[PDB]
Write a protein that binds this ligand. Structure first.
Ligand SMILES: CNc1ncnc2c1ncn2C
Length: 164
């Protein structure tokens, strides 16, 4: 079913994550963490305080797909055991030093061809696949985008609901 998923997405906020490489999304899925540039770090920390759920929706650049979505379970935190991100050019380890814990809601992929009917009012009504890293996605678009993903039957949202 999909009722707990809908409950988690109730009045959530959604942010588009654009990763320049697959390796970091794979690491994120394994280790339950994410890091972004300081400008986005600040926005996510603010939104983590503002909403029942903050949802990250991941797409690797040039893949033509989303690779899944996850819910922030913490604010960012610096200085722990370093995450071995593959660093994009011009991006230093210090720039990515803030670590968010995340709980994955879906690790299955969705091709851009299946979301062509969803546009994002916070990005000039462009298709929701289009957007810079950190672009916020409007509630109705974001909900519908998440509900398009194939079910991830490996996930139990019972714990995530307890965190809300
Ligand atoms: C682990 N964070 C990241 N990895 C790869 N690329 C990124 C990232 N953040 C923003 N961009 C463009």
């Amino acid at each position: 079913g999909t009722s707990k998923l809908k409950y988690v997405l109730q009045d959530a906020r959604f942010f588009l994550i654009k990763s320049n490489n697959h390796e970091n999304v794979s690491l994120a899925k394994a280790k339950g963490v994410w890091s972004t540039l300081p400008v986005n770090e600040k926005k996510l920390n603010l939104a983590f305080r503002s909403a029942r759920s903050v949802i990250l929706i991941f797409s690797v650049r040039e893949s033509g797909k989303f690779q899944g979505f996850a819910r922030l379970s913490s604010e960012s935190h610096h200085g722990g055991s370093p995450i071995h991100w593959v660093l994009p050019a011009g991006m230093s380890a210090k720039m990515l030093g803030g670590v968010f814990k995340i709980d994955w809601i879906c690790r299955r992929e969705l091709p851009f061809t299946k979301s062509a009917h969803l546009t994002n009012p916070w990005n000039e009504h462009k298709p929701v696949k289009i957007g810079r890293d950190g672009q916020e996605i409007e509630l109705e678009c974001g909900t519908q985008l998440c509900l398009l993903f194939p079910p991830d039957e490996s996930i139990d949202l019972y714990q995530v609901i307890h965190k809300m």
